[PDB]
Ligand binder design. Sequence first.
Ligand SMILES: Nc1ncnc2c1ncn2[C@@H]1O[C@H](CSCC[C@H](N)C(=O)O)[C@@H](O)[C@H]1O
Ligand SMILES: Nc1ncnc2c1ncn2[C@@H]1O[C@H](CSCC[C@H](N)C(=O)O)[C@@H](O)[C@H]1O
Lengths: 19, 19, 483, 483
Amino acid sequence: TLKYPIEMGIVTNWDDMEK
Amino acid sequence: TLKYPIEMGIVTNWDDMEK
Amino acid sequence: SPKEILNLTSELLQKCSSPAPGPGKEWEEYVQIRTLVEKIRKKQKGLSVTFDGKREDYFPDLMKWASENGASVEGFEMVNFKEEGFGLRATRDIKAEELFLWVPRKLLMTVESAKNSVLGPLYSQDRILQAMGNIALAFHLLCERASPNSFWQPYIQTLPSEYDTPLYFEEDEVRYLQSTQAIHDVFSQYKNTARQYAYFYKVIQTHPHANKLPLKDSFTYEDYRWAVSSVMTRQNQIPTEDGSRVTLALIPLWDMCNHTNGLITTGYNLEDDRCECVALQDFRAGEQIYIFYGTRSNAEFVIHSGFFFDNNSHDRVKIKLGVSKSDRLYAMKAEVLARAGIPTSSVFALHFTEPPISAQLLAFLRVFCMTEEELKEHLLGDSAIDRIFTLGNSEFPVSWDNEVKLWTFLEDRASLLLKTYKTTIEEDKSVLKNHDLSVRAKMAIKLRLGEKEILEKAVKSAAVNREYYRQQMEEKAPLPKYE
Amino acid sequence: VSPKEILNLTSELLQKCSSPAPGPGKEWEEYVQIRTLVEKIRKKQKGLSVTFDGKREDYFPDLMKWASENGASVEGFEMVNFKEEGFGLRATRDIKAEELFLWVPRKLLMTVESAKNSVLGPLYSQDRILQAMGNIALAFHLLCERASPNSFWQPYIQTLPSEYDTPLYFEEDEVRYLQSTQAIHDVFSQYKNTARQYAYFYKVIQTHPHANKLPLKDSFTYEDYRWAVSSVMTRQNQIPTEDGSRVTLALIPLWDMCNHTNGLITTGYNLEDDRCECVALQDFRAGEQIYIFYGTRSNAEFVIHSGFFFDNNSHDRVKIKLGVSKSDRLYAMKAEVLARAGIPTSSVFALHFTEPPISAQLLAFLRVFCMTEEELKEHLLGDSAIDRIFTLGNSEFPVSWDNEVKLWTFLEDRASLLLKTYKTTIEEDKSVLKNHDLSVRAKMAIKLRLGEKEILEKAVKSAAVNREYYRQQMEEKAPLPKY
Ligand SMILES: Nc1ncnc2c1ncn2[C@@H]1O[C@H](CSCC[C@H](N)C(=O)O)[C@@H](O)[C@H]1O
Ligand SMILES: Nc1ncnc2c1ncn2[C@@H]1O[C@H](CSCC[C@H](N)C(=O)O)[C@@H](O)[C@H]1O
């Protein structure tokens, strides 16, 4: 239903050496 | 028993105007 | 700004030194005092001295410092428990009655060490400090806290920074206590603490004996609220080293233990000059080590210790009673009470126990309901003193009629007291079940629920006792006689 | 105390945390080595560079006023410190399911774009890590505004927590509970990533000219960085850009005071009004905590990235790595069948705790993994080949009864094997939780390792049940369903 659902605390990649 | 039992947080009077 | 704070503290001192405004005005006075404190607190920088590390960063230095001065430091660790806060946890099995913890006097903060400290000169001049060792302890704690080289810094840096005494409650959390017995003690404590802060704020400014105190440069309301909350939740009464007087003390390491039901197992050992604690029960490795603080009520635990204890087996409420001067038998009743060592009017207790009343209250209630003929048998003749001797003893009533009168009276009075609360027991249970509440709010609601549950149990006990003695009277049973 | 001493320790830290992975058997040892360096640095620093005078709740009025001024919803809820979740929102009126009760316009948000336009803009324009990692850029945006007293976002930052329960905050013995689990490697990576990032940026900030006007140049502690990334990882959100073409990461004031419960996502971004909008997940009566559903994350993700363990997480899952081996004679046919079905030949699948235990993709993989050559032919050749691949993830249309029995035998055996790789059993975990008194962080770790095994144990039982059902179908020579 929601076009832009907002996930609280969504998991992100913190591995700077991978990125 | 214990000659000097110790009560943690023994209630004291804080009313400086009455005492 | 400094002239502004001195202005505001002057108003607070005069506000909190005014006489009690009458019980019906005490909430309004409370909110007035709160408004003034918060305005001061908002213009100040919180605790004058704060530390860089977390609370648990400093527990090693506490152990090392305690170890160097002869204290036990093996067999337990400090853990932050959700239910009680930080406490001690066994790292080995500890058997009931094992002496597992001891704290030599050198480590304690006492009224004596307060006297010999930088606070010494002011102590000897101020009449409040001299009369009230608990306030002396609180200032001792603040001065040493603000002294970076204090001997007691390893202890001070591990203390809590906040408490759950009613001084820290929000106004709406205290409001739940409206119409209870305890809220007057909450009012007193708030007014006491604000008056004391303003009084000593000005004294430190005006006295030359306070010149060397760190408090001369910074002394905030938060400083004082933290200090008195630290003292009231942790202080202890110990003998002087002389053994002939009692003093008040803070006992490091030991006072990390939290409370459970049991008996007191901590005592002072004069010969080795140290506090000693034996295990209240078996503690397996990995179990929290508890002690029994004392036989205090949940009102005392809330107001003076900052917590509410579920299944407090020593809970009690007050009941004020007195013989009326319009009673035609006042003179006789007063004399019998006096010969029994009981005042004509007093504040007694109702307990959450199988008998709700002590021997002293039972004796008072018997005299309260005595006929003139019964009073004369407690005043005259060679068996009168024998009769007084037994007045507090459930097994030897004055008469079946006397018992029926006193249990009828108590049932009616406890019933009346229940009717003075703003809510019922069922409404309190609904609040706790249907609302999501802070810990402080829950302490307040459980406290007012507990007052009513004790009164309700007193009503039930009194009704049952009334029926028991009414049966003995219908059956004309022989009265027991002490022989 | 020496600035050059910290720069040498961080240089040592950067080298240690930039070395390649040590191999999974050496990761715990490397973890303790990094912890030892970090703790040495941390104990030489002064904690959070910026601390505020008042209590956390002292600042909630300012946040509400600031949110109100910029068009956010500020009526119908209040901030309460709940024991279970920390601070949260509580309804002050009845709020009905699906009512739009909370909305936050974009100007209140902290985003990667507001980072670019702030004092961090120059350093952001040249640093390769900041440009590539919005989550790190947002962490430094947060630290720079925190140390800026006239910052527009100060009302938000003064209400943020000072401490979190991400594993970055655990003691060594608290993480030790997770030895032998799936989750502990990500705990290791988090700790190594954060330590490397702090050391890298500390050196950058102290030398790069585009950082000469950052408040962090005067003070940037490890505690600062641990707080900042924990703030971002427990609270960050992905939202569209203003023009809706791309996505960015954001901190959303006021709304991120809601705690998590089971349910559905009810927060969406309104691009037309340019604001976050939250509708009530369920009815909230006056006095009840307002909850939202964060997302379908596992308890491993909640612990590591959100800092809590959620009891009865309906989306809890563990990983299971599976792949067709090139030593299999049928590798080529299985690989092509998998490919036509959109499934890699080797992957990390999930096992779930709720029904169904395995997803469509894992069921399809397991069927192919156990297929005979003739079955594989039926999925590669002829006019029904594509129909058969269409149903490979459907539990109602098995390939054959024998295929099911082989795949459920395999899953049962592999789930059983995985269970035996944990250093404790499920009953042992339940005993520790029942018989030991534990910190919140300790319980999170033990409940996480317990949850991993309970999901594998449920997979073992479900596979046993399924194996028996399809073996009964076989022996009964039942007609195979057809779609
Ligand atoms: N049974 C109990 N339940 C909840 N809190 C308790 C408790 N027993 C003790 N406490 C807490 O402990 C205080 C006494 S000092 C005991 C150590 C304290 N928890 C600390 O962290 O320093 C009390 O004021 C109360 O805050
Ligand atoms: N269901 C839950 N149980 C325990 N903690 C929760 C929770 N939902 C959210 N939290 C806590 O809230 C954080 C998310 S931000 C939510 C507001 C937060 N409680 C605050 O005081 O600012 C999480 O990192 C976790 O600490």
